Design a protein around this nucleic acid. Sequence first.
RNA 1: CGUCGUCAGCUCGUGCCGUGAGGUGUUGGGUUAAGUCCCGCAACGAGCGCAACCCCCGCCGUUAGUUGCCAGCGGUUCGGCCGGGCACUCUAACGGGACUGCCCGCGAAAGCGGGAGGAAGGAGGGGACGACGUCUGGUCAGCAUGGCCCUUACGGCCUGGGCGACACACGUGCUACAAUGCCCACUACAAAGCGAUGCCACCCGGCAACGGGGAGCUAAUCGCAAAAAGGUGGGCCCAGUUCGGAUUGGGGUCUGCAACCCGACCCCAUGAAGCCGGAAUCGCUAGUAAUCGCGGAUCAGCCAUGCCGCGGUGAAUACG
Lengths: 127, 60, 24, 63, 98, 155, 206, 80
Amino acid sequence: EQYYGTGRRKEAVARVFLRPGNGKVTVNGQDFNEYFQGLVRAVAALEPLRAVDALGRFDAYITVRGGGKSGQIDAIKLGIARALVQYNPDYRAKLKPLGFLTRDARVVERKKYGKHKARRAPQYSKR
Amino acid sequence: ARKALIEKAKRTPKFKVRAYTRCVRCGRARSVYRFFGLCRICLRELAHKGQLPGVRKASW
Amino acid sequence: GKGDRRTRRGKIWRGTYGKYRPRK
Amino acid sequence: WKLEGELRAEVAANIKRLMDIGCYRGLRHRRGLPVRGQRTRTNARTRKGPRKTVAGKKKAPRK
Amino acid sequence: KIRIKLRGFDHKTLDASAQKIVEAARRSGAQVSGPIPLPTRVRRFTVIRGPFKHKDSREHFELRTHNRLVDIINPNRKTIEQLMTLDLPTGVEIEIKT
Amino acid sequence: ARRRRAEVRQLQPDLVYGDVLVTAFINKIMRDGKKNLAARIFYDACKIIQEKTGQEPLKVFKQAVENVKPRMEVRSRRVGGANYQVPMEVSPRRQQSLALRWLVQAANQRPERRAAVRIAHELMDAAEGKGGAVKKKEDVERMAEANRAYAHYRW
Amino acid sequence: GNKIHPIGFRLGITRDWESRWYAGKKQYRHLLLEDQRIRGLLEKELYSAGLARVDIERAADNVAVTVHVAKPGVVIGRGGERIRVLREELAKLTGKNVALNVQEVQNPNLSAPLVAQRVAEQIERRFAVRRAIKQAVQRVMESGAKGAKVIVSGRIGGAEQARTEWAAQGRVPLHTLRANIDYGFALARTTYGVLGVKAYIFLGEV
Amino acid sequence: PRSLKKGVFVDDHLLEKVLELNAKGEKRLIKTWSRRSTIVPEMVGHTIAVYNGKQHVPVYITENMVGHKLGEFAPTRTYR
RNA sequence: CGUCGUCAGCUCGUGCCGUGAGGUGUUGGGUUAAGUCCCGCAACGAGCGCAACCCCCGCCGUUAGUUGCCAGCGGUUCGGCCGGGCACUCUAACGGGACUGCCCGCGAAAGCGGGAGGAAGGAGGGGACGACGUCUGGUCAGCAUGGCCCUUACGGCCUGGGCGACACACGUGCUACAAUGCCCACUACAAAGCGAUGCCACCCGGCAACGGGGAGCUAAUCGCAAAAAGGUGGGCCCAGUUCGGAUUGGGGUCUGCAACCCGACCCCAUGAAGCCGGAAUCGCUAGUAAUCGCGGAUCAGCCAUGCCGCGGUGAAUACG
Ligand SMILES: [Zn+2]
């Protein structure tokens, strides 16, 4: 009837809803190719599908809010990866070795004082 | 921070643009926070004692 | 660039609005 | 619009004026220093011309 | 429909406080909307550590304010009885608008 | 790197050829992390290699890298006074880094106003064995083997 | 010149504030300046009583104030006549209308502020600094405490060269964020100059 | 590209003191610390002496220099 | 408060060695980010420091739902707008989870390598946190304080000027020299913050700064706010240019008693140097550098291109 998987990346949340069907994707309304209009990376998000020969077998409604269309592309990629497991829990065996079921914990680094950008340290002359 | 120069409390700005914060504890006019009436120093001194209600040490 | 006060960026950089970066 | 020569004539005419009257702004023109109240301790080359280096004082961290 | 809004500095002086308000009125009115959290507003004070120079000393101080809501629809006298005068915390301060 | 032997960051394959080496090259084109414009340029270029060249872009590319990889390079070294330039092999790893870097560099050294083209044309020239990229490569080997006397400082 | 205030450092845990009351924006600065006015007099007066802390709770025009002392008597007064003078001198400062409780200090020998003042005083009377210090650490260490330490500033004995005296026993982990170390500082005006006094007392842990 | 808006400012120390002299014609000198004031026609012909912040310099106010502000005719700093 | 230095050290107690200063312990072998741990040993333990206990970010669950969504149903001015519903995102409080715990390999042990599960590991990523001491380090100008000095004044009030001067020298930066770019238009994703005379919706007058009018907000429910880079379409066509905006002339807004000295902003004109920088020299090992915009404190206004902080996109390289 329906399947779920969230998915978060670099501060992005993607609600992934798979549903046996054609293979289209409605990201926040616009078509998959409409929200990510011209982003050589987009293709990534659906990689967990091709992982187990899905896509042209499923369908996906997706809500995405937070971060940037790049982070969303990874949240969504994780969503489609999780949801694809509630469906058949047997997918892990091949879906995980790729690492799709991991939550990239790489986040912006705090901006420490004394320094220009958390690390970028100010420069000196005839020290 | 001479008593003499703490005429700031005098209101009587003649014109309200001559008004100026001043520390409500040391007179440290130079970097007085509003929310406290205290200068960057005293604010730090008191925060260490605990006399600044719900003013813990930040970190993240 | 960010420096031309009479362009989009020049206005954005200077955090202002005018004939070159109207409110909308 | 007032263009070309006739314009340069005006502008030149203006400057000449605030320059004839004790106008400080006019003196800044004579002295050749920036008029719109900028710093003249450093950065005024666009108005001064090329640096005119002189002898100086070393050991006194002028860094 | 009595909307309560609780704010405090201690995230316990509230969960304690606002929780009393829940168990109390849960015997004289509706059933309460449960104490709903609500984002916290933090105030940062970045100060130079010592006096005179040392621009890169610093040390951070924040004054985080917490909020709680609750919401009791179906006000029924006894509700305003179990609540009206039976609070306890000192580091709290309420505002209610039924 | 005093402690470990810093392992190589493994890159996610291409979003079209699924070739890691490509991502690498695209990363060398990128600047200010504007990885989209970077990816575009390399693909537009691949389509410029399709038109003006009846060959598959991917193979033209790899061919290029190949001719641009130096197999010997000179590394300075202090040996009794003077700093003799010792000639020596080049790691497989370093060969790539240099090849790709050199390509992008020579590519941005070309005249054609369009970024995507300079890459397109540079790659091709490289394949044929000509172009600023292969120059540097052959210049390097020349440098070594011309200092092959101090090669007994093997390093 | 390193190390943070052991209290301010632990405020989140093993140590509560001296003023616990909500407020904000338009009030906070006014409602705080007051607290200082309060503490101001209490310390200026209740000296001989042995001040140690001045908790100040609030809710609305009905302040708290719970002065902590070693000699609760000196505070109260005869039958309670002084707690009348002060408690009144109080509202002549804050129309607010406020209470004035008084708790007794269970062994002023575990009150960093006290141990400090204790030493600060001796030093003012011209006692041998190092001795006074060792003694103090002993008293504190000799009546409970899993650790203690005292530090006197400089110009020890009026010496032309400012020095710095020590003394310490048992664990006194300033680094362990959970120790529960009472910190106390005492000044010490003198013919030759000011000399700060620091008292550190360690109790339990968790 | 100067600008005040609507209400050309002029301290009335010298103002109501300059026009009072307009009744008997003119006068022979003035002296105000109000270098902050704009110059109005009524000042023309007159001779107001402005303050350096140290001296009172005699400034003959002519038409050509109306809109300006007195101080612009009493130099502050001393150079070369 | 800075600093060596977050460096892996500095010591004590008792014992033992030495006429003594002192030594042993703290050295040796293995290991570690670490005086970390293991084995050894006339040493046995301990204190300060390391680590841990605290905060932010990674995954899961409970409680709570005016944040949230047809997930799921009916309606629609089809705006999650309406009813409704807490599932989900989220909000904030608590609980779980990682410990070389399990599997194979070497080892005496600590542990090293490898593998499974897992969101995650072998200190998972970033903070707070700085030992005994050193520099006669920094600050009597924040405050405190010994001593010396001044008291019609080395005090106090005021107006004005100065701290903003310049032939020059240096440091830290901003903007840039352009096509991986600049301009115009259209269109899309963020976080953390701040708001009472304060944020300012929307409407009107103005090219505009801004003015007039005026709704809501007491602020997860209103406002600042537009994110910018980006995607789509057009223009420019390699030129000191539709690069670059200094400088200067004019008009004007706004704050403020007051913007000459000496404010910021808007519009017209002007349109400089600069075509990538000598010797020499600085930063950063990953979500880092690089690049893009957003907020805040101070604050009437503002010389912010500074400082503290936020998220977006996102590398190269490390033999040694
Ligand atoms: Zn102060």
